[PDB]
């Protein structure tokens, strides 16, 4: 244990801050909550699924569950199928998906070096 | 353009979770809040300072300020000097400091591979 041990541990908070700044930027630009963004990303990754299934991947507090999905519908990112409720990506926002992904890619790229520097310090503890 | 793009972006949440898990592991073992751990580490990094000075390094919400610093006093990690309040590390706990830093080192090492794998995926976005 030395000065570098304590500095390295403190870089956990640095790295955390960088990640939270990325999310905060996406949230404000797209007027979405953290949960809404994670839902949309998960939908793109895994494809169409029921709300109960999406619950397994993203924590949505019961008090705002219907609000959360309604918000994604009103933004036109998703639509519902009723056979249980199944959500689908609205393929009419394909270009908007590409733009959002590029916005996140740029936000990440701007902090890549700093994030790797922090993690090097963390892992060297 | 696309995928593995979405996967990498989702690893932001994974990496965030890893960091929070490390803090949660420390919190449970040492019966300290996140703020208390950061205060203690900052104290070891920078040395003795006033509460006002510490509050610029670590976010301590005013409603939990008095219990945050009192908890550190009751755990015997620090003591107060009154000229504004100045806090000092209690050097009787030098061995405990070393043990805490080793505990943190182990919690990091436990997740180090996964964390670097997450950051590689993030940076590849």
Swiss-Prot record, chains A, B:
GO terms for molecular function: DNA binding; DNA-binding transcription factor activity. The keyword Cytoplasm does not apply. Residues 51-74 bind DNA. The gene is rot. Belongs to the rot family. It comes from Staphylococcus aureus (strain MRSA252). This is HTH-type transcriptional regulator rot. The lineage of its organism: Bacteria, Bacillati, Bacillota, Bacilli, Bacillales. Global regulator with both positive and negative effects that mediates modulation of several genes involved in virulence. Also, modulates the expression of genes not previously implicated in pathogenesis. Keywords: Activator, DNA-binding, Repressor, Transcription, Transcription regulation, Virulence. Signal peptide: none annotated. GO terms for biological process: response to stress. It comes from the Bacteria.
């Amino acid at each position: 244990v030395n000065n570098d041990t304590v500095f390295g541990i403190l870089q956990l908070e640095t790295l955390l801050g960088d990640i939270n700044s990325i999310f905060s930027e996406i949230e404000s630009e797209y007027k979405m909550s953290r949960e809404e963004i994670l839902i949309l990303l998960t939908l793109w990754q895994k494809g169409s699924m029921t709300l109960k299934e999406m619950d397994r991947f993203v924590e949505v507090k019961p008090y705002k569950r219907t609000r959360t999905y309604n918000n994604l519908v009103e933004l036109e990112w998703i639509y519902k199928e009723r056979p249980t409720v199944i959500i689908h990506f609205n393929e009419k926002l394909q270009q908007e998906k590409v733009e959002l992904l590029n916005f996140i890619s740029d936000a990440i790229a701007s902090r890549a070096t700093a994030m790797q520097n922090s993690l090097n310090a963390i892992i060297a503890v």
